[PDB]
Every structure is written in structure tokens, then in C-alpha cells.
CSV table of C-alpha atoms and ligand atoms in Angstrom, one decimal:
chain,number,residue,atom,x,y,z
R,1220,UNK,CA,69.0,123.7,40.6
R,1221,UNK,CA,71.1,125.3,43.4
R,1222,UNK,CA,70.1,128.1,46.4
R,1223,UNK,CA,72.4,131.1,46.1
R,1224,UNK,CA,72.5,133.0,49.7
R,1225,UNK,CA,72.1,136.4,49.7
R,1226,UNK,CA,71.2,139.6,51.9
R,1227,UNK,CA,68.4,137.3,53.5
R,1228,UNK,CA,70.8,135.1,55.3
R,1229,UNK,CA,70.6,135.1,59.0
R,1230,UNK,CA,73.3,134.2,61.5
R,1231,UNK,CA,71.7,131.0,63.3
R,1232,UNK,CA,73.0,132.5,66.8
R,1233,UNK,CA,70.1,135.4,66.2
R,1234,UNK,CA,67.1,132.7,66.6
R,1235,UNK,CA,65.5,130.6,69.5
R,1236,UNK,CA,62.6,128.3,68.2
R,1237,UNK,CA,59.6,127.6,71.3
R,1238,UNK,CA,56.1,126.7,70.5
R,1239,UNK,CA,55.9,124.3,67.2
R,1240,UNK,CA,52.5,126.0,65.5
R,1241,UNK,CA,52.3,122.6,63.2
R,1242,UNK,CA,53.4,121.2,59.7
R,1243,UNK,CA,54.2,122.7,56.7
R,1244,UNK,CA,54.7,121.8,53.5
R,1245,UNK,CA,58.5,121.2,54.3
R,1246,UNK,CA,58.8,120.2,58.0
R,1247,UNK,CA,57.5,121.8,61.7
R,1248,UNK,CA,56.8,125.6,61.6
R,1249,UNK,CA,57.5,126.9,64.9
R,1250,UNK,CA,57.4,130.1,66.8
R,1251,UNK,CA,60.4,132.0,68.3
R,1252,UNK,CA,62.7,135.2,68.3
R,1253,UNK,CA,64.9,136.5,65.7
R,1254,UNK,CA,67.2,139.5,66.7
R,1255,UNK,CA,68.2,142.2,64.4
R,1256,UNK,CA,65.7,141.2,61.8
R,1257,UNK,CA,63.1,144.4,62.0
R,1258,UNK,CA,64.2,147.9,61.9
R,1259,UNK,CA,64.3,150.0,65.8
R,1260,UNK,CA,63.4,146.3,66.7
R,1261,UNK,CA,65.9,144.0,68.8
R,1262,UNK,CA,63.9,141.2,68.8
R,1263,UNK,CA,60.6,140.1,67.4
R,1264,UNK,CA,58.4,137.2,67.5
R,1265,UNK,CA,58.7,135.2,64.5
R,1266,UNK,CA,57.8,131.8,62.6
R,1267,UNK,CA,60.3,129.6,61.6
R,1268,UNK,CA,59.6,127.6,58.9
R,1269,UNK,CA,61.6,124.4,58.8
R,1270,UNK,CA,63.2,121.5,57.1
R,1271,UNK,CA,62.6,118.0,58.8
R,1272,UNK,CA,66.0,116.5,59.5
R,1273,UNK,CA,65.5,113.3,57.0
R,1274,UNK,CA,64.6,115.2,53.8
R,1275,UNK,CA,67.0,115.5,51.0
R,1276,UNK,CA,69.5,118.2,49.6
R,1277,UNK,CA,66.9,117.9,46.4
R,1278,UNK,CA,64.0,119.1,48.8
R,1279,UNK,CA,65.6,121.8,51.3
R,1280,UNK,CA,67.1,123.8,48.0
R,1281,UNK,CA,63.0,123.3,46.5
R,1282,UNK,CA,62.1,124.8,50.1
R,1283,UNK,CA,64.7,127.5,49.9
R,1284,UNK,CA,63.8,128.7,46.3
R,1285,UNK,CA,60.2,128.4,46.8
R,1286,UNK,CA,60.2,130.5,50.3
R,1287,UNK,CA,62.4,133.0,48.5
R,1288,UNK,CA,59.4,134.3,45.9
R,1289,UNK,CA,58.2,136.0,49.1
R,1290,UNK,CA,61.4,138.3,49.0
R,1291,UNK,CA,59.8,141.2,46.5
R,1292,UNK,CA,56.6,142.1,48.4
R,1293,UNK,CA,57.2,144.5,50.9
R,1294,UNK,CA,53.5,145.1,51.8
R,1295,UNK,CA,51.3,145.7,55.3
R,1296,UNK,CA,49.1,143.3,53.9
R,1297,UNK,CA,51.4,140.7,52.8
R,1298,UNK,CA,52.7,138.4,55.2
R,1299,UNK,CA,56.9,139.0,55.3
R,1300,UNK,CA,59.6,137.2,55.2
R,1301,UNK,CA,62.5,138.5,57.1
R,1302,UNK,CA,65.4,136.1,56.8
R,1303,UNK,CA,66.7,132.6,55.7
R,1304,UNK,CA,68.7,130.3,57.7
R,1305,UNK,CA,70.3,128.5,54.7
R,1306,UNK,CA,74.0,128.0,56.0
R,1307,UNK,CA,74.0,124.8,58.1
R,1308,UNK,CA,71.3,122.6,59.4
R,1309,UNK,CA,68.4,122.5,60.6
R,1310,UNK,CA,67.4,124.8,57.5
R,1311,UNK,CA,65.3,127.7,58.3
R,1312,UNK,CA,63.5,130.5,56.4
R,1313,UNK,CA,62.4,133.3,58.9
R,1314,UNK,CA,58.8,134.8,58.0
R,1315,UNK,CA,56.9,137.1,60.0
R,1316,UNK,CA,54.1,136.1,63.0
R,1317,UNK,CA,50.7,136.0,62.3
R,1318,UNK,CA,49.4,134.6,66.2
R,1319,UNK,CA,45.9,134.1,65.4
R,1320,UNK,CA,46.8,132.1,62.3
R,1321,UNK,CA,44.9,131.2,59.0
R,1322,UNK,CA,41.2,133.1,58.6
R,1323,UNK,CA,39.6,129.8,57.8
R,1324,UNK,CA,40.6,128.5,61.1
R,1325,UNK,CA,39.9,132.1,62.6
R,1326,UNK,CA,36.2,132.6,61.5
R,1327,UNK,CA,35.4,128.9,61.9
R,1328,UNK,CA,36.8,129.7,65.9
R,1329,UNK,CA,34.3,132.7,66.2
R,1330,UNK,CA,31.2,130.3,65.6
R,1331,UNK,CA,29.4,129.7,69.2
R,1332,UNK,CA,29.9,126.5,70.4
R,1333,UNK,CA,27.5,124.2,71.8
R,1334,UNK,CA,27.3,124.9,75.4
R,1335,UNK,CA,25.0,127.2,77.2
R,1336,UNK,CA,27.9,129.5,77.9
R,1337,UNK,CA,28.1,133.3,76.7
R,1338,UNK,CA,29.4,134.1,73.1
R,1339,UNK,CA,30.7,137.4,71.6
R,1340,UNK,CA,28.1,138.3,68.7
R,1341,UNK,CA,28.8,137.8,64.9
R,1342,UNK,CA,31.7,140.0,63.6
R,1343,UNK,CA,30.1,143.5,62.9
R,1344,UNK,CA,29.7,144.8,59.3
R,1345,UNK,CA,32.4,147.4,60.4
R,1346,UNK,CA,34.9,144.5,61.0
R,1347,UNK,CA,33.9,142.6,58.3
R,1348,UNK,CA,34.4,145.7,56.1
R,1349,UNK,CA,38.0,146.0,57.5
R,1350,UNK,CA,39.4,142.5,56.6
R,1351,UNK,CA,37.5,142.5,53.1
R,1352,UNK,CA,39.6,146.1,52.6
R,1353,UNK,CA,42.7,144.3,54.0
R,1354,UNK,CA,42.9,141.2,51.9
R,1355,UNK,CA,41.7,143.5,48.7
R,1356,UNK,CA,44.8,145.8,49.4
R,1357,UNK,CA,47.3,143.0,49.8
R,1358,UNK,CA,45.8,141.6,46.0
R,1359,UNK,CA,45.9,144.9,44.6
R,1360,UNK,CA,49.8,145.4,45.5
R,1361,UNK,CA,50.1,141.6,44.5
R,1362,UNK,CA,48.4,142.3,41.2
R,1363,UNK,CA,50.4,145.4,40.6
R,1364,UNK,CA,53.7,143.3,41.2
R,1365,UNK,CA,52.3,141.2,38.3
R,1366,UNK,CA,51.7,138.4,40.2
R,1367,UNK,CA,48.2,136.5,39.8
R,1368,UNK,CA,47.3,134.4,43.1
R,1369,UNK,CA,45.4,131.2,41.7
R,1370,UNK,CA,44.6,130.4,45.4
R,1371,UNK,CA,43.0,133.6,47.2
R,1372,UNK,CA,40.7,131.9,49.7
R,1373,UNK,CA,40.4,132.4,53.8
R,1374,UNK,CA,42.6,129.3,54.1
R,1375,UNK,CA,45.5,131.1,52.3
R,1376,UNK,CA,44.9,134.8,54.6
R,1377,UNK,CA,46.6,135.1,57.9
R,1378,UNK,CA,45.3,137.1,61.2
R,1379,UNK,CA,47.6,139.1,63.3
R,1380,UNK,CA,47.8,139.8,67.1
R,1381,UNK,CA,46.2,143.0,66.6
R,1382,UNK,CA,43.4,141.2,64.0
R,1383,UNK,CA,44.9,142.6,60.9
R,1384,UNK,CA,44.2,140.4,57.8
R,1385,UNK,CA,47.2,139.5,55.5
R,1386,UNK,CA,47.5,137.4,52.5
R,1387,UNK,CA,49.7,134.3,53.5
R,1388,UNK,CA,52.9,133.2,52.9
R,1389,UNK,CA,52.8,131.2,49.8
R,1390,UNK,CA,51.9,127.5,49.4
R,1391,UNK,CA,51.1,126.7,53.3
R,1392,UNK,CA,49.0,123.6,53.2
R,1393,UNK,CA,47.5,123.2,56.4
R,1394,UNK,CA,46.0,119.5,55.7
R,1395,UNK,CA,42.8,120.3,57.6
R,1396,UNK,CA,41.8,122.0,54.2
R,1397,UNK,CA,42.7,119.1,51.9
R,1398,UNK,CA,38.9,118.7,51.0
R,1399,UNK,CA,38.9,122.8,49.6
R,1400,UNK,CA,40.7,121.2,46.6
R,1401,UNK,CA,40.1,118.6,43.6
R,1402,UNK,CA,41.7,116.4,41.3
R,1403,UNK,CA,39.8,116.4,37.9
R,1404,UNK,CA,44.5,116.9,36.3
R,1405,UNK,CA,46.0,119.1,38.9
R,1406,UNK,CA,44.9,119.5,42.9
R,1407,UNK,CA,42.4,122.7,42.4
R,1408,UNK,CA,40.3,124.6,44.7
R,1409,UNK,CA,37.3,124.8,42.2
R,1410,UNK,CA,34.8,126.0,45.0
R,1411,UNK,CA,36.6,129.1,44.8
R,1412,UNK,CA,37.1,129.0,41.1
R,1413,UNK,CA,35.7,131.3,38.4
R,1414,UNK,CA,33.8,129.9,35.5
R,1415,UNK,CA,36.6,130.8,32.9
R,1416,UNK,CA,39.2,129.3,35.1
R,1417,UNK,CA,36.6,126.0,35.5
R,1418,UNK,CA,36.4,126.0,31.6
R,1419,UNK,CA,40.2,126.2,30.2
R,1420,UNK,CA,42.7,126.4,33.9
R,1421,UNK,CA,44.1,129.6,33.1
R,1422,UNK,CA,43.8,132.0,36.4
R,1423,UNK,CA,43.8,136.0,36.2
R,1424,UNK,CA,43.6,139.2,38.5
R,1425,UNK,CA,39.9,138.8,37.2
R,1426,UNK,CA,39.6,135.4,38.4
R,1427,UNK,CA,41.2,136.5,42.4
R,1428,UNK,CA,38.9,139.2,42.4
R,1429,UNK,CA,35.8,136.5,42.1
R,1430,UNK,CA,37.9,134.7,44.7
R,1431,UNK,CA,37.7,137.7,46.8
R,1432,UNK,CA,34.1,137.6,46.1
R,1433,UNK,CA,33.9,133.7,48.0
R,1434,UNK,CA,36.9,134.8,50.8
R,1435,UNK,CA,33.9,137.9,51.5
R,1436,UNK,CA,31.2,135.0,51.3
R,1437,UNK,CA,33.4,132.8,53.6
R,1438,UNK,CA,33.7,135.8,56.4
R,1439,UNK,CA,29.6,136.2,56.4
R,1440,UNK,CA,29.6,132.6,56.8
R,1441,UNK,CA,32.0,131.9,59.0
R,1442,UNK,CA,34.0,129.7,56.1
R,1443,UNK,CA,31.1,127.4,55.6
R,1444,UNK,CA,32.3,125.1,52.7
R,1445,UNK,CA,31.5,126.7,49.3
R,1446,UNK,CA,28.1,125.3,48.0
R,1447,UNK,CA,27.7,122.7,50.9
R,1448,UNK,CA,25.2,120.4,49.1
R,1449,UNK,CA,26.8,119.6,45.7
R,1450,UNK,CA,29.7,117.5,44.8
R,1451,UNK,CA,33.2,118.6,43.6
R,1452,UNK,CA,31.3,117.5,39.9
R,1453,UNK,CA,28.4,119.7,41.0
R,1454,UNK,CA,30.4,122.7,42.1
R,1455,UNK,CA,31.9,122.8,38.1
R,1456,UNK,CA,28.6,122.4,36.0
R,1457,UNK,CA,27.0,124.8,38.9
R,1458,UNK,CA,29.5,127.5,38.3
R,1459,UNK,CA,30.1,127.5,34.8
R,1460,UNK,CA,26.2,127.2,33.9
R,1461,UNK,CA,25.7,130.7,35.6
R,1462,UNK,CA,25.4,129.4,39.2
R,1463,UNK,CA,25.9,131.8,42.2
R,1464,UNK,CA,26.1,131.3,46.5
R,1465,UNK,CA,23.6,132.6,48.2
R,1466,UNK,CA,23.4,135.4,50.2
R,1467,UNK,CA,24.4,134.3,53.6
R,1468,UNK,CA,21.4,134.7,56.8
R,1469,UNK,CA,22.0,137.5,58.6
R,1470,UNK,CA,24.7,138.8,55.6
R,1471,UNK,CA,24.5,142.7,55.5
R,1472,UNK,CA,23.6,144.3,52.4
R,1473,UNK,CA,26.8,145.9,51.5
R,1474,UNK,CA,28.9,143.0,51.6
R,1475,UNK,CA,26.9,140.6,49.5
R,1476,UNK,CA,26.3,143.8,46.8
R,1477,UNK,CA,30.4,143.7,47.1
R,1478,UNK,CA,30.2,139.5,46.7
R,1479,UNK,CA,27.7,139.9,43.6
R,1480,UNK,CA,30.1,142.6,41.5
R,1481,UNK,CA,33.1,140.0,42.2
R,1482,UNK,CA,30.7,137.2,40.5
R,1483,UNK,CA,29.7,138.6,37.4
R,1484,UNK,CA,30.0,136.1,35.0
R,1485,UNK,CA,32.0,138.5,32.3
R,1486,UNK,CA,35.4,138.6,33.7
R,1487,UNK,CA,35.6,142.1,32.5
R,1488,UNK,CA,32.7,143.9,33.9
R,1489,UNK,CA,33.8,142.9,37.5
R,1490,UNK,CA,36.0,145.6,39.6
R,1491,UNK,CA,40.0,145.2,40.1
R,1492,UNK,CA,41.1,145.4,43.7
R,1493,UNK,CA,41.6,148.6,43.5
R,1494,UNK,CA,38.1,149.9,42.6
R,1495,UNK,CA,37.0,147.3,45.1
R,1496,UNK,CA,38.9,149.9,48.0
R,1497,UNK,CA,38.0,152.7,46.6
R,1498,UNK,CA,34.1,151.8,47.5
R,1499,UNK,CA,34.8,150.8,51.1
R,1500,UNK,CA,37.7,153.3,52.2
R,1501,UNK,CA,35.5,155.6,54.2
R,1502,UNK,CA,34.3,152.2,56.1
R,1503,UNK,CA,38.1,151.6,56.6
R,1504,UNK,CA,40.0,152.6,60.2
R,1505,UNK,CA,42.1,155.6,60.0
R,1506,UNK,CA,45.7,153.9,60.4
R,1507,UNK,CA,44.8,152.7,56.8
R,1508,UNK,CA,45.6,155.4,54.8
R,1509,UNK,CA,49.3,154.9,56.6
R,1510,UNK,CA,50.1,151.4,56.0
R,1511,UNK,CA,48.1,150.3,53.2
R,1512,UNK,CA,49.6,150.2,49.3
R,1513,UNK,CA,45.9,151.6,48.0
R,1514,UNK,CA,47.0,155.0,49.7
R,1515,UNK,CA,50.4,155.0,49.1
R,1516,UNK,CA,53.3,156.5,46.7
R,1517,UNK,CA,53.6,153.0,44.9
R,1518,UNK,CA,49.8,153.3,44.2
R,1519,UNK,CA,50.4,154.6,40.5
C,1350,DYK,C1,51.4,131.9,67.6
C,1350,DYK,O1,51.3,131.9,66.2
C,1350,DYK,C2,50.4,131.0,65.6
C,1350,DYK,C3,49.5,130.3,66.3
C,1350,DYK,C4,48.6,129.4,65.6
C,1350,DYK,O2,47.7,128.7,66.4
C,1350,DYK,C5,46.3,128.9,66.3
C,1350,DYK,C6,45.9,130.3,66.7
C,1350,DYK,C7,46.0,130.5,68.3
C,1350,DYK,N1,45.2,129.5,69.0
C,1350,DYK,C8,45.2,129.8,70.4
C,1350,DYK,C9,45.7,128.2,68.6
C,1350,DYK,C10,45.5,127.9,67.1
C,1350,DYK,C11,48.6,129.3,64.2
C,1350,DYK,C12,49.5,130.1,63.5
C,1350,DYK,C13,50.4,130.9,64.2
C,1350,DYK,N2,51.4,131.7,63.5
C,1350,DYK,C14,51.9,131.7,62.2
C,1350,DYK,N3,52.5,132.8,61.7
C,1350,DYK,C15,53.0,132.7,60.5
C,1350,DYK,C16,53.0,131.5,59.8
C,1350,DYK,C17,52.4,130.4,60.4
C,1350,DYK,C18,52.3,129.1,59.8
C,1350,DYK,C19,52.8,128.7,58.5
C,1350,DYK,N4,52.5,127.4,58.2
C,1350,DYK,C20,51.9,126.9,59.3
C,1350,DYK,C21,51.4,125.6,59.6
C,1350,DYK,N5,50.8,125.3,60.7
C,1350,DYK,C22,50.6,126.2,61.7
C,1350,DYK,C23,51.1,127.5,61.5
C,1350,DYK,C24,51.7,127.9,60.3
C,1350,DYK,N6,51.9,130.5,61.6
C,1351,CL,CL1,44.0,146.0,41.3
């Protein structure tokens, strides 16, 4: 296996790394600036995704193919990747900046903190509406690239400057979230898993849209760990035996309706992404019919 560069590859000379944002599954991601890498855009605020300077050929051409997968999607709701720094070293792939990182880490910072200090309110049904439509547009363009996530959890979405939700770059382990998967013999997030995929580890469209159906649970929550009181062994008998979360305190009615369609048991009789828009696009903001895949040409 070699890395091939291509129409990706960035002259080193156009980026400046600044604030290092923490580890990836390679090395250090950092912010900076990349010029000439967005169209009517000199520069924009990027993250560079790195190769720590001890790891081996073997590992920064794994890194380089890996990172690459995220060259097809061109999506609003798909985190970008906008270059790769593959001649030379330190190794860099180029991906587009998402300030207010990971949702998990995002909802579980929007919980009020234990001082007698004022708190902004829960997120509003409105803005709860918004991300659900946000994440279920970046699956439905995902789905209709072929692609089947396997991982669609808050953990694995990324919040912009302006609050948009995106689903994020692929494979970022942030090792906070170790706990979110087990060993029973792959590493598998079964707390987010559907009862077919707990029975025979084979992952569908059908099986992100349940997914969907926790990342929405997660959101009314506040990304409260998927059945809190039972064990990893728990969570798989609980699932595949029929079991269902429970409607969150203080959930709005809407959203858990929206959780209980993604959890029917019958893989079938739940809604694609799609059909999962079309019920909440009047709750949607207007720039959505603009940017999103579900109202564009592509949208076939
Ligand atoms: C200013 O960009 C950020 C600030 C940030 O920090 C948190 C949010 C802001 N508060 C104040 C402090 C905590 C977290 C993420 C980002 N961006 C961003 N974009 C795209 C990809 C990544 C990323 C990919 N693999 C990672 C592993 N580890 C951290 C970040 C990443 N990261
Ligand atoms: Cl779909």
C-alpha cells in the first residue's frame, strides 16, 4: 500500500498551525490558516490534522488513505476536507473548522453547573429540531453516496461557529468517549446499536437511522450515557429483547414521537433520512432549503 498525491495536495507555504485542539487518532490536531483553499476565500480557519513525528512510513500512508475517504462528499452537512499536506513532513491533511467541536462535548457543556450563578435555559424544541434536521440531511446525502455510517452518535457530529450541526470527519476518537464502545470481537458502540446489528454485526441505512433515533435522545438529554443503569451485557439482551430509552423529563413531544419511529424494532417499517426531513422541514430555518442536500438538485 502506497499514497498517490493528487488535486488535494497543498503547498506547505499556504498553512500556519496555532492552537493544538487535542489528539487524534494519528497525532495533534491543531487549528490554523490555509490560503487558497475555499473559493472567493483568501484564507480560512482550518484544522490540521497531523502525523506525530516518531510514527512510521507504514502509519502516515494508513493516515493519508484513511483521511482521503472524506474526498467524495461535498455536503453542508458533512464536515470537509479541503487539502492534504502529503509532500514532506510533518504530514498534514487539511479539513474544515468546526470551533465548538464534537456535540457530545457540546450538549454535555450546555448542562448548568453547580454554582448559584445564572444559566441559559435548555435548548428550545426549535433548536433541537434544527440539529436533528441537520445531522438527518448529512445521513441522507451519506446514504445516497452509498455509504452506511456504523458509528452515527453525538460523539461522531461536529458544531460550527454559527451552531450548525455536521456529521464528523471520519474515525476521530476523542478518548474521553472510550467507555461509548465494547469489546464482546470488535470495539462497538452497542448503546447506540440496533437490535439486528446486536444479533449478527451487519450495519445498514436502517440501522443509522435508529442511531439517529439515540443521537435525538442524546440532544434531549444532554448526551446522558445510553441506558445509564445496565451493563455493556445489559444494554445487548435489553435491546434485542424489545427494550426501548425512555422518554427524556422535560423531552417535547415531537422529538421523542421522531425517537420512537427510528426505534421500531422491524428495520423496515422505520423512515429513511429522507422521510425523517420531510416531517420537520417547515420547523427548519429558511437558509436550509439553500444549503441542505434534502432540497437540492442531487436530491433524486
Ligand atoms: C477551535 O476549534 C475547536 C475547538 C475545540 O475546543 C472545544 C470547543 C471550544 N471550547 C472553548 C473548548 C473546547 C474542539 C474542536 C475544534 N475544532 C475542530 N474542527 C475540526 C476537527 C476537529 C478535531 C478533529 N479531531 C480532534 C481531536 N481533538 C480535538 C479536536 C479535533 N476540531
Ligand atoms: Cl435517506
Amino acid at each position: 500500500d502506497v499514497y498517490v498525491p493528487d488535486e488535494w495536495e497543498v503547498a506547505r507555504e499556504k498553512i500556519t498551525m496555532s492552537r493544538e485542539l487535542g489528539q487524534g487518532s494519528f497525532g495533534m490536531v491543531y487549528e490554523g490558516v490555509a490560503k487558497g483553499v475555499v473559493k472567493d476565500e483568501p484564507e480560512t480557519r482550518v484544522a490540521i490534522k497531523t502525523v506525530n513525528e516518531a510514527a512510521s512510513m507504514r502509519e502516515r500512508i494508513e493516515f493519508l488513505n484513511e483521511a482521503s475517504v472524506m474526498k467524495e462528499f461535498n455536503c453542508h452537512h458533512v464536515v470537509r476536507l479541503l487539502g492534504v499536506v502529503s509532500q514532506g513532513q510533518p504530514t498534514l491533511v487539511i479539513m474544515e473548522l468546526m470551533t465548538r467541536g464534537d456535540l457530545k462535548s457540546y450538549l454535555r457543556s450546555l448542562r448548568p453547573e453547580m454554582e448559584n450563578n445564572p444559566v441559559l435555559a435548555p435548548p428550545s424544541l426549535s433548536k433541537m429540531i434544527q440539529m436533528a434536521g441537520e445531522i438527518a440531511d448529512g445521513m441522507a446525502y451519506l446514504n445516497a453516496n452509498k455509504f452506511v455510517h456504523r458509528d452515527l452518535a453525538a460523539r461522531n457530529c461536529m458544531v460550527a461557529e454559527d451552531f450548525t450541526v455536521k456529521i464528523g470527519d471520519f474515525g476521530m476518537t476523542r478518548d474521553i468517549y472510550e467507555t461509548d464502545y465494547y469489546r464482546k470481537k470488535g470495539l462497538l458502540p452497542v448503546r447506540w446499536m440496533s437490535p439486528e446489528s446486536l444479533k449478527d454485526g451487519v450495519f445498514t441505512t436502517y440501522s443509522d437511522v435508529w442511531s439517529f433515533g439515540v443521537v435525538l435522545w442524546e440532544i434531549a438529554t444532554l448526551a446522558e450515557q445510553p441506558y445509564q443503569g445496565l451493563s455493556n451485557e445489559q444494554v445487548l439482551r435489553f435491546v434485542m429483547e424489545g427494550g426501548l430509552l425512555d422518554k427524556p423529563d422535560n423531552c417535547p413531544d415531537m422529538l421523542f414521537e421522531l425517537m420512537r419511529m427510528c426505534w421500531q424494532y422491524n428495520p423496515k417499517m422505520r423512515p429513511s433520512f429522507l422521510e425523517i426531513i420531510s416531517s420537520i422541514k417547515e420547523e427548519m430555518e429558511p437558509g436550509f432549503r439553500e444549503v441542505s442536500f434534502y432540497y437540492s438538485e442531487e436530491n433524486k
